[PDB]
Design a protein around this ligand. Structure first.
Ligand SMILES: CC(=O)N[C@H]1[C@@H](OP(=O)(O)OP(=O)(O)OC[C@H]2O[C@@H](n3ccc(=O)[nH]c3=O)[C@H](O)[C@@H]2O)O[C@H](CO)[C@@H](O)[C@@H]1O
Ligand SMILES: CC(=O)N[C@H]1[C@@H](OP(=O)(O)OP(=O)(O)OC[C@H]2O[C@@H](n3ccc(=O)[nH]c3=O)[C@H](O)[C@@H]2O)O[C@H](CO)[C@@H](O)[C@@H]1O
Ligand SMILES: CC(=O)N[C@H]1[C@@H](OP(=O)(O)OP(=O)(O)OC[C@H]2O[C@@H](n3ccc(=O)[nH]c3=O)[C@H](O)[C@@H]2O)O[C@H](CO)[C@@H](O)[C@@H]1O
Ligand SMILES: CC(=O)N[C@H]1[C@@H](OP(=O)(O)OP(=O)(O)OC[C@H]2O[C@@H](n3ccc(=O)[nH]c3=O)[C@H](O)[C@@H]2O)O[C@H](CO)[C@@H](O)[C@@H]1O
Lengths: 419, 419, 419, 419
């Protein structure tokens, strides 16, 4: 396994260019399964998740190719199954379900198992599909779906807010008979992006971005060219990178409107933030960040994807911070790792109390999940001495060349195919 | 002191006309503090809470009078405070805050104390105001706010979804200099209703009903005529009345689109439902309800105000149901009371596991919650023998003559005064 | 209703004599139901709760008289039921259950309803009796028990650590045919106190105070005289009164060994402590307390009955404090009351995060818990100006003359007759 | 990286011998560090952890060798540190801390990070040692302890019931100056076990098994011969194995009173059990298990180590069943895996509602926990079809030849390897 070897303390400063959103590219790649014509998705970051998606798409009899773009030829889809291998590697493989059943009348996907950060059930996906008129059964650990002819429009109310289930139900409804109404739908920028992608293809959708999505079924989906939005989570991680290192920074290729809460939290931290129409600028004035209070919740509130990062920010901040996590059950893995580094913290249920310390100490830590890994990398950057982050493979699923981007910021980092 | 005597088991069936929403009439009644001209609010239910707002209003130097409607004249407001006594009996009293300091540059409201259901801080209200330029301080239990001149519109991202704080900020913003953007705003129907009422007065509002409300501060508010929307909770309660009694019912004067989550849940419990534009039809077909799973959350998800009612539904349903509460948490007072009647249930944190039973037994129970404890009267209706619900002043707070409506559905119930 | 008018701030200094424990007196009074001959219980505090138990005993046909002692003659008990009204005034009434069935083969108690601090089910009580051979049915809110012949000893492993259930099962077992083992029994000092009492009556018990209590049933219990232990919560509460007021105090007629957790906690808050066989001295050296961390759990861990008091301590302590409640998840009524007084806290589920402030301010607050009540009176002592605590009926239930005790310490406190 | 291959449905029945308990051998093996004369530890199971423990022992400069028993020679203990690699592969490595600082005046151990089942902080181990006078610092991920001369005994009250912290403080105190008192100590059979081992070495200990452990510091410890006690968890796992299958079983070298809670639950599940001073016999009578309720708490209540095992039982049992976990935050990993097998389960916070299903289908699943692992395997042992369990290394951590044992019990299990 690769590892990162980092040395600090180090002031993170400079310019950085945001990559396409991991969370927009994924659901759009799966949506392409609905397209009968050549498709061109632009601004797709290079990630292990995209690789696994191209690999899975190919397995489905799809024609895939990439650079900054990813060329998709879904005209010939031949197989209808996502093997245990793929789902195991990438949860998002569940996304092939809706499109497959909507276009082909059948589809199978290995029932995901527990996750690093939570049980992560797909109950809502299956449920939405059933509402759409698909027959679903569990066999050999396989979620078996099928429908006779076309899916049927329906008024579906979501139990809880789910990004993934909204993508799943939204996607399949595009090809169904009638009108679909997804109530209590996720408002995530990536939901909007995926809906727009679907509309580019000839779908009838409205309300994307609000708690209510209306879809009018159409005979088929063509093809086109779509540019995935900027990654709000990568952007956030960089703003933070600067905010905890007394540095300054400018984010090129960003979409400020997707991160209001994060920006508000940064300001509450004592950050000097300014925004353009495609750029964000943060300045710490050499100052130490102030502790803030954080409560994760669905968009546009504070995203759970920024959580590990904010904890880090609280850990080297002046004051006592409190972080409450409402989306994921086991999303504190980063904490004990940071303590190993000299941070003071206490966990109580779904909340962690942060007692800011002046400086961090280099140590050997373990990446457990993607966004915590990026938190550990950032911790290494500011901590004293050497920090080695084991299992940086997590980082590589959701981050495109993070070592390089950090390096350009003045980071002392080496990817090590060691020990 | 007021008590309900109920005899069952009794099949609930017939017709019912839904009154005006308590939760829409309250905030509109306080927003009236902004109008410099005679205002008439139509379709106001006759509730103890409405009497209290009237009382609070009068003491502000306000001209108030009611019947079907409530006549308001706030051109002469001289007193700027909500006393301890009123805030005690009536929590919504805090709503006087925003309008007062927006309109007169000042306001005082007693800080609400302990609440059985979950404790309920108003941090969000205060914070919101402060974001608008108001200076706030705590004195002798009173939240004191003031502003030199006019409030300044701001970009406010809510830490959490708050019906109350949203109304406070939305209301006050109508009179500020500039634009106010409320991100992560509550989507409640009563919010659309209050925004609409504010516009009827001369306010510039948009986004009401979505997570992003925009307010263009205007110079002053006039007066007008506005009809309060139907009561969604009262509707669901009656719907549940039929669903738990093998009954059949028709709701007249309803606004179906405000209760999709409740309609969907009911369907899941085996109910045959149909809707028109101002009516809702429910039929159990003599059927005992099917256990279901509930998760309260912000609108349009499952409403915490329907919670105790659904716990009842679960308690006498086939199978094991689960009620999880994310808004109030300690909102399970009805449970032990129902266990007094034969129900089988365990409370684990913010969740109640429901073990459905065939029959309930009449017994003496205690009302405590203004919406929860209508559940005890519903339970009385279908329970074996005689049930006495003490302290019915609770139901009188949120339910307009519930015994008259129940009686017309075929219930054996009598309001025994004093004892 | 009665009330407390308190004026501060006031440093709490002096001596106090600890009363007999409310919590040992109660179960011992109920156990006296098993005695065939006159019984004398010494050191019984004068409390509303003792009044109520006396009333209940009398209704059963018990002969009861009191001063410092309580005189009992249960030789001619003729009635076997605890009525709705009694149980509603004081839940300990459920304690009549076990002794009635074991001795008379029959017993009826009104099923306790919802509680302020938590649902407080009595499933373990009922279950344990059933394990001993009692037949039990729920009729009109009454837990009707009966045992064809004589109770039978059984091996009982408790699902949860329960003071109430351990007392009920233990009392009943004394008259059971055979042997009874209570595995995972509560270790509360009061459990030990009640067990010695039973022994003094001729019962065969051992293990009291440890995880497994063994009871060798006997044909009959006679009479005797028993001296109740000192009230640990009263003791802890006075300790807190000095630890939060930079004062000094000595407790007379105390039992240090029953409060090690509280003592250790106090030390951490920076208190100078000394103890002897029957006394405890607390010296804050004029110092403000250091925020501490608290986790309620079964004895000998930190007692949930000291919880609200430590919350108060954290509230005026230096630093950020954390209070976690594992016995009663809703035991936070006092927090918002304290917030009304200038305190700074956030409630996250079963945990309250305390941010110590320099001073508190007088305000009108409402008592609710026969323990937060005390906390509010303490806060009044150290707060700036005038504090009024409504509903002090609560205090009277758990504290014997708390105003004279405080008064003797320097407290400016007056009992107002309603206004 | 091997993986079990399983096939069913198979009826588990017959006779199995119980190995030494993993939980006693470990801390006992660590207490060895104190023994000046060769010690012979008996009944030690062949476990990955036992090997890793020996490896760790060796590194400190200790003679270690084994078979059925382990030989230790702490005579020439030269080295003072636990290496990152060891602490990483085995958390229990923190155990070497008390012995090192007690016996050698110094001791360093790599700070454990996050755990599979939860954060698992060692705050109590550290805080305790400090009560003993040890100076402790964190440097480079290393917990650094040292003491000027000898550890002074002190009165210590445990914030929480920690088995590990109870072993560490008890162990270190055996060589302390004066008497040590551990209040609110863990009561686990493994503490009784370890305490006995320590006394056997010439140390003064009492209270072991109760909530109060008293230690009188002695001048030094020597050798001896000690036999570890029977593995309660293994016994429970086997008893369950035989209960979920409808079979019969008999455990050898069992010690029944270490598991009263598990036994009673099995009876609630309708299983015919009998005990003898040495052995345990479970007979399902070909009957299917009955859904039960479970709450994990410290010994003697239901152990968390039997949690996953009981979820399985509930999963394939008649009716719904509830399981609540109070010891570990993230201990439901096995659930999603189980669902992959066709089980109906809902997770709510720290509670899992188990909907008993008639049958389980073979499927590929992932072992994650050294306790759930056994759960998946058992699941296969009764599932219709073929089941492959990945990363079965977990089993090897606390399971001596479990495939062998299961096979003797009539199971279709094969340890596939390679790939
Ligand atoms: C590839 C991708 O887009 N990943 C993002 C997506 O994941 P993901 O799509 O999994 O997010 P969801 O919003 O669906 O999950 C949120 C909550 O809903 C629960 N749930 C979800 C679906 C279901 O059928 N049943 C159910 O119980 C979850 O287990 C969790 O407790 O949204 C998360 C929340 O912003 C982000 O943190 C992830 O980075
Ligand atoms: C008069 C009225 O219309 N009452 C309704 C309104 O009350 P209310 O306005 O009080 O509802 P909120 O939406 O504000 O409260 C929701 C959640 O937010 C928390 N919170 C709220 C405000 C704040 O400043 N800080 C904070 O932490 C609460 O304590 C709770 O945990 O919405 C509730 C939820 O839909 C309904 O059940 C009430 O019947
Ligand atoms: C009159 C008296 O002596 N009162 C004390 C006693 O009350 P009480 O006897 O009610 O205390 P319990 O120990 O039984 O209750 C503790 C926990 O067990 C639960 N539980 C209890 C019984 C049962 O059958 N089922 C069940 O689930 C409770 O609801 C709670 O979650 O112990 C409490 C905890 O030390 C103290 O705060 C009370 O002041
Ligand atoms: C090798 C061994 O003997 N393992 C057992 C031991 O582990 P372990 O020794 O780790 O068990 P603990 O009793 O210490 O842990 C119990 C609870 O206390 C907490 N805690 C503990 C120590 C501390 O310093 N701080 C703290 O917060 C824990 O993180 C957990 O929430 O007991 C557990 C509980 O029966 C078993 O499931 C483990 O199989």
């Amino acid at each position: 396994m690769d590892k990162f070897r980092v040395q600090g303390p180090t002031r993170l400063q400079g310019e950085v260019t945001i990559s396409g959103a991991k969370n927009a590219a994924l659901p759009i790649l799966f949506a392409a399964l609905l397209a009968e014509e050549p498709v061109e998705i632009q601004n797709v970051p290079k990630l292990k998740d995209i690789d696994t998606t191209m690999k899975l798409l190919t397995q489905l009899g799809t024609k895939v190719e990439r650079x900054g773009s990813v060329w998709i030829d879904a005209s010939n889809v031949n197989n209808f199954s996502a093997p245990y291998d793929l789902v195991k590697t990438m949860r998002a493989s569940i996304w092939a379900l809706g499109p497959l059943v909507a276009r082909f009348g059948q589809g199978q996907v290995s029932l995901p198992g527990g996750d690093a950060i939570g049980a992560r059930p797909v109950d809502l996906h299956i449920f939405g599909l059933e509402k759409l008129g698909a027959e679903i059964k569990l066999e050999e650990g396989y979620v078996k779906a099928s429908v006779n002819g076309r899916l049927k429009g329906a008024h579906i109310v979501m139990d809880k807010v789910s990004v993934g289930a909204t993508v799943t139900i939204m996607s399949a409804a595009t090809l169904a008979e009638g009108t679909t109404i997804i109530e209590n739908a996720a408002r995530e920028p990536e939901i909007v992006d995926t809906a727009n992608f679907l509309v580019a293809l000839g779908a009838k959708i409205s309300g994307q971005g609000t708690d209510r999505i209306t879809i009018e079924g159409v005979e088929r989906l063509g093809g086109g060219v779509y540019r995935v939005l900027p990654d709000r989570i990568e952007t956030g991680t960089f703003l933070v990178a600067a905010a905890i290192s007394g540095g300054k920074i400018v984010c090129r290729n960003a979409q400020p409107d997707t991160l209001d809460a994060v920006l508000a939290k940064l300001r509450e931290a004592g950050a000097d933030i300014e925004t353009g129409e495609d750029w964000i600028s943060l300045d710490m004035h050499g100052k130490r960040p102030k502790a803030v209070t954080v409560r994760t919740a669905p968009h546009p509130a504070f995203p759970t994807d920024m959580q590990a990062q904010f904890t880090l920010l609280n850990l080297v901040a002046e004051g006592t911070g409190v972080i409450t996590e409402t989306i994921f059950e086991n999303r504190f893995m980063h904490v004990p790792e940071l303590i190993r580094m000299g941070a003071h913290a206490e966990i109580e249920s779904n909340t962690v109390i942060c007692h800011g310390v002046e400086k961090l100490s280099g140590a050997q830590v373990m990446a457990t999940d993607l966004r915590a890994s990026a938190s550990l990398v950032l911790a290494g950057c500011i901590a004293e001495g050497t920090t080695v982050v084991d299992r940086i493979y997590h980082i590589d699923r959701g981050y495109e060349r993070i070592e390089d981007k950090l390096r350009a910021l003045g980071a002392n980092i080496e990817r090590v195919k060691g020990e």
